């Protein structure tokens, strides 16, 4: 059980240090602005650690959010 789709699979090629590729970094956050776990991102220890540092830079630039409202219920 708990079988979703991996974020890495859906993407093709991309630089984990590009803190401006919103269109692609967005794919790494939840319905909420939270940074997806590794079970969802499919990244590796090392990569996930860089992604995190990148998503955070874009957030400071106002390109990515810190948190969004959950719509549903």
């Amino acid at each position: 059980p708990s079988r979703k789709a991996k974020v890495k699979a859906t993407l093709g090629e991309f630089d984990l240090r590009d803190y401006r590729n919103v269109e692609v970094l967005k794919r790494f956050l939840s319905e909420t602005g939270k940074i997806l776990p590794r079970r969802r991102t499919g990244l590796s220890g090392k990569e996930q650690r860089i992604l995190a540092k990148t998503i955070k830079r874009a957030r400071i630039l106002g390109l990515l959010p810190f948190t969004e409202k959950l719509v549903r219920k």
Binding site: F66, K69, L70, V71, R72, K73
Partner: protein
């Protein structure tokens, strides 16, 4: 007396009460209700029924402004948070949408001893 038609329903749920606030399309409240506004004095206020009543009360006081549709917004986890939502879905008031916006810190103020327990 301003015929607003559509607005926002705010459900403030907590383990002690549920307070509902209906507002106009941009935040300003029209009418509100709560577990205490409906007679429940003690802890009955936290009960889910009190929520259901508080919501219904809120909606009725809203229809008085010709309110038809509204966007719900929940904050809190306490009981009756769900009855409050359902109440509004049975109150003729069209629930345009439901959104959870509970405020959560990015770790700031040291919580009360009560809310720290095992951290």
């Amino acid at each position: 007396k301003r015929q607003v038609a559509s607005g926002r329903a705010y459900i403030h749920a907590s383990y002690n009460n549920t307070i509902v606030t209906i507002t106009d399309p941009d935040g300003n409240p029209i009418t509100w209700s709560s577990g205490g506004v409906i007679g429940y004095k003690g802890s009955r206020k936290g009960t889910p029924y009190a929520a259901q009543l508080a919501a219904l009360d809120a909606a009725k006081k809203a229809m008085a402004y010709g309110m038809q549709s509204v966007d719900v917004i929940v904050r809190g986890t306490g009981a009756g948070r769900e009855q409050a939502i359902r109440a509004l879905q049975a109150s003729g008031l069209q629930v345009k949408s439901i959104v959870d916006d509970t405020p959560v810190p990015h770790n700031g103020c040291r919580p009360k001893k009560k809310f720290r327990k095992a951290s």
